[PDB]
């Protein structure tokens, strides 16, 4: 929800073109009282309670809630026998048929999230393998999130990636109050 | 717009067995967009309804209405189509089974009443339908006599039961 910005806008009775003068004065004729065309009763008029402008839906949870969400999602992925840990992603050939037949043999599923770290030391074989498949995904470790872990069936981490995840999620426990944001030096914090 | 009366001439039945009745002919015809009201046309379509085709042509040649000549032309072309294409051999052997009139598409005009006011005149149009069946015209249903009324009353007195118990 938080990244959503809805661009719906509809014209009220003040922005519809024309509709200035009063048609058929008040007391004389025998029709219904009306003060303006382009009123919300009329055909072609403006809306009464339409959507208004580009609307934002941005709201931020406490960061402990998001870190606990990552920890909970990793625990659910481990407890249901879907989590798999590699020592180093490397494929011998580099065609996607080898990777799909391997995942079919090891009984992973249709969808699997292959996670490596730092986005630059990802080897050429796994990149050339997953760049054409639609169900096999590579993301760097900074790109982890709960939605991609819930959508994909099984989950593949790496041993430097799982050490990075342990350190970055255990840093949330046993920490002070911010007192100014953590992008500043903060002698212990890198 | 819907034209379904004209498609009724393109039905084809399977060929009959020898030990069967004749299955007399049925001919559908209509003329669209007649400059005439639908009610005044309906009175002529009710005049025709059950009679034979020659008696209908007789009653329409001497009826002094604008729809009478139109229905006489429709009946003449329907008789000609019945003799030529639809395998009816005796020209006088036809009676009207269905004949009615429906409202056609209309236009709108102004009336210019006697102030700065007005009405909406409608240029009315109507259709005419007709269905011919070969054979003699069926006799009219006679008015039911006293013995039929007494039989119905005695039958109703026979058919009553002991109500609201067992």
């Amino acid at each position: 929800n938080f990244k959503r910005i809805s661009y719906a806008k509809t014209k009220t009775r003040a922005e519809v073109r024309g509709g200035g003068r009063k048609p058929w004065p008040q007391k004389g004729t025998g029709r219904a009282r009306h003060g303006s065309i382009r009123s919300p009763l009329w055909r072609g008029g403006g809306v009464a309670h339409g959507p208004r402008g580009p609307t934002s839906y941005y709201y931020m949870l406490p960061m402990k809630v998001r870190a606990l969400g990552l920890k909970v999602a990793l625990t659910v992925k481990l407890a249901q026998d879907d989590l798999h840990i590699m020592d180093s992603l490397e494929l011998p050939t580099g065609d996607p048929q080898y990777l799909t037949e391997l995942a079919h043999y090891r009984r992973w599923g249709d969808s699997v999230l292959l996670v490596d770290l730092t986005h630059e030391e990802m080897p050429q074989s796994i990149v050339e393998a997953t760049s054409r498949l639609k169900t096999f995904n590579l993301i760097p470790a900074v790109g982890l999130n709960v939605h991609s872990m819930l959508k994909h069936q099984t989950l593949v981490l790496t041993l430097p990636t799982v050490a990075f995840l342990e350190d970055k999620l255990l840093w949330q426990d046993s920490r002070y109050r911010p007192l100014y944001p953590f992008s500043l030096p903060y002698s212990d914090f890198p | 717009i819907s034209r379904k009366w004209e498609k009724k001439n393109k039905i084809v039945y399977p060929p009959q067995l020898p030990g069967e009745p004749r299955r007399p002919a049925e001919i559908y015809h209509c003329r669209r967009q007649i400059k005439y009201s639908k009610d005044k046309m309906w009175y002529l379509a009710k005049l025709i309804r059950g009679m034979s085709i020659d008696q209908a042509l007789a009653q329409l040649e001497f009826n002094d209405k604008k729809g009478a000549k139109i229905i006489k032309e429709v009946l003449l072309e329907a008789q000609d189509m019945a003799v030529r294409d639809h395998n009816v051999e005796f020209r006088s052997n036809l009676y009207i089974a269905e004949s009615t009139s429906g409202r056609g598409q209309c236009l709108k005009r102004i009336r210019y009443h006697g102030r700065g006011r007005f009405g909406i005149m409608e240029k009315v149009y109507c259709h005419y339908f007709v269905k011919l069946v070969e054979g003699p015209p069926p006799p009219p249903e006679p008015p039911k006599t006293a013995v039929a009324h007494a039989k119905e009353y005695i039958q109703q007195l026979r058919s009553r039961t002991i109500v609201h118990t067992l």
Partner: peptide, 14 residues
Amino acid sequence: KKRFTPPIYQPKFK
């Protein structure tokens, strides 16, 4: 007073 209302014509295209 002399209370009177003018009549209103409709558009001619209708």
